[PDB]
Amino acid sequence: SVKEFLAKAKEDFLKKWENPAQNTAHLDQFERIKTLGTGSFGRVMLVKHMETGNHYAMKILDKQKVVKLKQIEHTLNEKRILQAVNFPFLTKLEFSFKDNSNLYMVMEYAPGGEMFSHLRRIGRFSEPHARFYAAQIVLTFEYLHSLDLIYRDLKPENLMIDQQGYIKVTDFGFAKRVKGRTWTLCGTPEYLAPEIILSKGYNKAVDWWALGVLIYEMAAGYPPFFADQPIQIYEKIVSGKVRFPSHFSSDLKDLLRNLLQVDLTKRFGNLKNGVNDIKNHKWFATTDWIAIYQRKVEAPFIPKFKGPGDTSNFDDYEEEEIRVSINEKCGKEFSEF
Amino acid sequence: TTYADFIASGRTGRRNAIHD
Ligand SMILES: c1cnc2[nH]ccc2c1
Numbered sequence: 001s002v003k004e005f006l007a008k009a010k011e012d013f014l015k016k017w018e019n020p021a022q023n024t025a026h027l028d029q030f031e032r033i034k035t036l037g038t039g040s041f042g043r044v045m046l047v048k049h050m051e052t053g054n055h056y057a058m059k060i061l062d063k064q065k066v067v068k069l070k071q072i073e074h075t076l077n078e079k080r081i082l083q084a085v086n087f088p089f090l091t092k093l094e095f096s097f098k099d100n101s102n103l104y105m106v107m108e109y110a111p112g113g114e115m116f117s118h119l120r121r122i123g124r125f126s127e128p129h130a131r132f133y134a135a136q137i138v139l140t141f142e143y144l145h146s147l148d149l150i151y152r153d154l155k156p157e158n159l160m161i162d163q164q165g166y167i168k169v170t171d172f173g174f175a176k177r178v179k180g181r182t183w184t185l186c187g188t189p190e191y192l193a194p195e196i197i198l199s200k201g202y203n204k205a206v207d208w209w210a211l212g213v214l215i216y217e218m219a220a221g222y223p224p225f226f227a228d229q230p231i232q233i234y235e236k237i238v239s240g241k242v243r244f245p246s247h248f249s250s251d252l253k254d255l256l257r258n259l260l261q262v263d264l265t266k267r268f269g270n271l272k273n274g275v276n277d278i279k280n281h282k283w284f285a286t287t288d289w290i291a292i293y294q295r296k297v298e299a300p301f302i303p304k305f306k307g308p309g310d311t312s313n314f315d316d317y318e319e320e321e322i323r324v325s326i327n328e329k330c331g332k333e334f335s336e337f
Numbered sequence: 338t339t340y341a342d343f344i345a346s347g348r349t350g351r352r353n354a355i356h357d
Contacts (some may be wrong), residue, residue: 039353069356115349155350174354181346190353222343227349230355 004263005145007202010084013147016084017177022337025049025095027104027322030058033319040069041173043320046109046311049119055309056094057110057170060292060322061103063330072172073331074186077337079105080171081149088295089140091160091168098337099103110168112161112303113313115218119156121179124221127249129300131283133159133167134215135292138284140169141211144274145204148177155188156217162311165299178203189230194262197234208269212259220245220254224260238262251283 020055030047033055037044043063049056062135069249078182082105083093093106098104119125125133137154143292152174160168174186181201193209195202224243231314240262244253256276261267279289293296303313343349 041354071356121341121347153354185357186354188354190348192344192355222340226343226348227347243339 003144006143009143010147012086013084015219016156017226017247019082020336021093021096023097025097025104025106027097027324028057030106032322034311034314035319036311036314038317040065041071043317046309047106048309049106055109056106057091059106059107061101062106063098063101063334067101067330067333069194074173074176076173076336077176079103081175081177082089082107082172085144085147085149087140087143088293089136089167089169090143091170094216096337098334100328103337105336107170108168109157110160110162111305111308111310111313112163112165112169114157115159115161115167116156117313117315118161118301118303119218125218126300127219127252127283128254128286130215130218131287132292132300133218133299134211135284135287135289137169137211137214139274139289139293141204141207141269144175145207145275148179148214149175150178150182150204151175151207151210152208153191154214156214157188161287161303162226163305164295165302166295183238185191189233190217190225192237195264196240203263204269205267205270207258208267209261211269211278214244215259216244216256224256239259250280250282251285255281255283264285284307316335318337 031050033048035043040061044067045058047058061075066072079096085092091234093105093107095106096104153171158171160170163167165196176182181203183201191210191213193206196206213223225233227233242260256266264270268274269275271277
């Protein structure tokens with residue numbers, strides 16, 4: 001049963017949530033290989049764990065920069081959640097630690113690259129190719145939401161493709177364990193639900209809205225609301241209007257009208273039937289949810305590899321030092337990390 | 338076309354998160 005699987009999952013999660021792992025490695029145990037992504041909100045590197053020779057993705061945050069950006073609690077959320085979860089389409093923390101300058105989160109490496117890269121290159125995905133990825137997100141959100149977690153940053157940039165062509169939902173910087181309503185303005189303009197833009201209290205329904213955005217973007221090759229500046233995007237999102245490409249199936253358009261529903265009473269994922277209004281929709285009729293979860297469905301695209309620690313599916317970024325001060329920074333702020 | 342309008346826009350690259 002799904003209910004019963006989730007009950008056991010929650011028991012597993014709560015135990016780790018209430019007693020988080022802490023200080024389970026050291027920077028000197030890893031060989032730094034390459035920057036896989038980078039921004040104001042930190043960076044992610046491929047590293048090699050020397051004791052096992054396993055490759056991992058290592059997120060590095062500069063404690064001082066986190067503080068300046070008011071992301072202290074959000075970062076504590078990220079680490080505390082990611083050490084506790086366990087799901088085929090999430091990369092839980094294998095290790096975390098900190099030093100005088102930085103916070104380190106070490107996770108399973110997905111060598112296939114960001115969905116963003118393949119989506120942009122290829123143009124758009126077929127409806128079946130998109131449905132295969134969407135199915136994985138639906139299951140992940142069912143899992144997360146059952147643990148009272150909201151994700152808050154769905155987009156192809158955060159979705160990594162693994163060796164089998166299945167995805168990992170990465171970057172939990174805005175993820176939060178909340179019962180009831182929350183208020184933080186966060187996420188990415190194109191994927192922001194109207195509630196968020198209009199400064200309302202909001203709930204897990206914003207993730208189901210973001211799903212509508214992702215499915216649209218995957219199938220169309222561009223997002224349903226775009227413009228050159230965020231403010232113009234926000235005007236489109238709250239308008240209540242969306243246009244679909246002529247090639248979108250009838251089933252696809254119907255799913256999306258119900259995901260991209262400005263009215264919370266009518267948004268799929270937020271009705272009394274919850275996620276099953278999505279899972280039982282005609283667009284997913286061919287989807288075997290257990291086969292997806294078990295990862296026995298054949299991926300519509302498997303990525304090119306040329307070995308372990310291959311990075312050819314990732315863009316090249318300027319490589320910056322990992323500096324470690326001789327003075328501890330922000331000790332109290334990140335005491336629990 | 339909508340595709341052409343997208344490709345000519347400033348937001349075809351990786352998109353940054355926002356905040357207060
Ligand atoms: C790139 C590849 N694999 C990853 N796992 C977690 C984050 C991340 C980024």
